[PDB]
Copies of this chain bind each other. A is one copy, B any other.
């Protein structure tokens, strides 16, 4: 049962990350990208989270860093820990902002 316990631990960790992302995104980007309205438009939770992360990168992380570190100007298909690097850079940018 400790396997399920650790699965629940990972669930808590991703839930906390989603919490941080939401609490910053609602106050930073817009109300149009709210979880309720996105779900009504018909996007899964992971799709909603990745779209919010990409919008966060497009707001804070500058395009030169997008096309140099992530090697592509379009964040439409860069998802992964490169997106993790981009959201970390966005966190640094909002910290210094």
Interface residues of A, Cβ cutoff 8 Å to B: 8-9, 11-12, 14-19, 22-23, 36, 45, 62, 64-65, 67-69, 71, 73, 81-82, 84-85, 88-89, 91-92, 95-96
Work out how many copies of this chain go into the complex. 5
Q: Are B92 and A69 in contact (CB under 8 A)?
A: yes
In the assembled complex, how far is the CB of residue A70 from the closest CB belonging to chain B, in whole angstroms?
A: 9
Q: Are A12 and B9 in contact (CB under 8 A)?
A: no
Q: Are B65 and A96 in contact (CB under 8 A)?
A: yes
Majority-rule SS of A interface residues: helix
Q: Beyond A11-B11, A18-B15, is A64–B85 a contact (Cβ under 8 Å)?
A: no
Q: Which residues of B contact A18 (CB under 8 A)?
A: 11-12, 15-16, 19
